[PDB]
Design a protein around this ligand. Structure first.
Ligand SMILES: [Cl-]
Ligand SMILES: [Cl-]
Ligand SMILES: [Cl-]
Ligand SMILES: [Cl-]
Ligand SMILES: [Mg+2]
Ligand SMILES: [Mg+2]
Ligand code: NA
Ligand code: NA
Lengths: 290, 290
């Protein structure tokens, strides 16, 4: 063995890397994270950190050969999709900046990034209202397709000079705990979503998979300390487990449009009526301005 | 971070695993090794260990979910291809048996396995005649293809119930040192061969790549202790670096047919003449029998 590792064993580059509010294992050959783990709470998702002051850039700790660069993504037909969201790190400028390191980024469909995936990230943030602590493992997937002749093929695009791997699917393992003193099994949900436009019709539960099925597909073992026979319980069994629909989501966007200059506030309300337009909290903001 | 890894970070399953005469890093999602490192010498490739007493079987140390089984390979149209060869472990029954663990095996083209790849393994064994110590890193690759429209796609087949990944290419990093007291840079050669029939016409040097180019494609850093600016020298610059041709190879097979019962030895010589048939060492064996 001393003869065998005389000049050292090859470097896989898959060791866990820690950041302020997220940890990850990088995939040196695909130039994408393999998994990204974060902890989120009521407090962490509140703060003055601003997404606008952040810039996407290679992770300084990754060898430049195995790193992706913005040139790989810009003009590819694919977006720079965060795995650990910027929006879960309002409490810390450092933490938010570190989620803009390309080591947390994956070539994600533009519509999925701002649509379905966004609503899943929003649902994870919502859970902090009902669970004191939420844990999330996010990451890419290159799943096979079975042709008519019975053959199973893994087919994915590589973008840029660096051949950044475009996944077919994205996963999220949501682990949620009520309080520190709770003795009830922790709520777990595993979801696999295709890297394409999805819309509002499909329910999040349509994309649910078993933890074992996700582990088999991804080659990973999530939250190894949890005893699968006593510590885990389906999140759907103990939570509404629903994303915001078209009406709830467009209302959420319009409420955020209520903050920014002029009497443009009349134009926002005219657009909502042109079928949604209600909500009580909405008015306690569409008055506190004018 | 204590909050973040409360239930542990996900398990990648990519840690180095040591065996008697080989080490490897497994790819839990593809069910194939990522790299396999071995040390070979004049002595190790000599012994009474017999390939016939060995059986292909899942590696006992791999979680069965991430392991491949013979059922995945048998009937797939692909062979069980050793990365660390059985033939490099004649000195040890244990060592040879451990190279039959599916953790060392890759779905390899039947012809490449017995043809070109076999001759590369033979060339590695030959180097022990000229270098006291030879180190070898072997492994699979899924490289992209550029379509006519400019798009780069990684396309590979998955075989069996377990979806064992069929590589497009196979690599070998050959590290060779003259003696323990030598101060000359070590001889290095990196080669990438497609997972298909190749034949005798292509020279091994047609498949040579730079170490840096292999590292970029594979996402690995080979022999990290070697200073690339002072310790390494192209193997082609200091070695014949040639595989056995059709005549040398068929003669080598016939010499091995000289060991096994009857006066079938006349039939072997008749087949050689039917254009090759010479060699001096050959006769010192085709007499020591009859
Ligand atoms: Cl983008
Ligand atoms: Cl969508
Ligand atoms: Cl076979
Ligand atoms: Cl061949
Ligand atoms: Mg996003
Ligand atoms: Mg072989
Ligand atoms: Na590009
Ligand atoms: Na099969």
């Amino acid at each position: 063995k001393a003869v065998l590792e005389q000049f050292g064993f090859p470097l896989t580059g898959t060791e866990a890397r820690c950041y302020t509010n997220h940890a990850l294992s990088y995939d040196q050959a695909k130039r994408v994270p393999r998994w990204v783990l974060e902890h989120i709470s009521k407090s962490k998702i509140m703060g003055d950190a601003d997404r606008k002051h952040c810039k996407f850039k290679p992770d300084p700790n990754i060898p430049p050969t195995f790193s992706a660069f913005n040139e790989d993504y810009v003009g590819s037909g694919w977006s720079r999709g965060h795995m650990a969201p910027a929006g879960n790190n309002k409490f810390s400028s450092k933490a938010m900046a570190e989620t803009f390191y390309l080591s947390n980024i994956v070539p994600q469909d533009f519509d999925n990034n701002s649509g379905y995936w966004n609503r899943i990230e929003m649902y994870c943030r919502e859970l902090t209202e009902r669970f004191e602590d939420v844990w999330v493992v996010s990451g890419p997937l290159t799943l096979p397709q079975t042709r008519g002749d019975g053959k199973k093929i893994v087919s994915y695009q590589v973008i840029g000079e660096d051949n950044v791997a475009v996944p077919s699917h994205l996963y999220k393992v949501i682990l949620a705990r009520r309080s520190s003193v709770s003795t009830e099994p922790l709520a777990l949900g595993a979801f696999v979503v295709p890297n394409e436009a999805i819309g509002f019709q499909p329910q999040l539960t349509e994309f649910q998979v078993s933890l074992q099925d996700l582990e088999k597909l991804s080659g990973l073992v999530f939250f190894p300390h949890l005893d699968r026979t006593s510590d885990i319980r389906n999140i759907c069994s103990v939570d509404t487990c629903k994303l915001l629909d078209f009406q709830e989501f467009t209302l959420y966007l319009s409420t955020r449009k209520i903050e920014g200059s002029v009497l443009r506030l009349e134009k926002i309300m005219v657009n909502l009526k042109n079928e949604i337009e209600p909500d009580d909290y909405f008015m306690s903001r569409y008055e506190k301005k004018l």
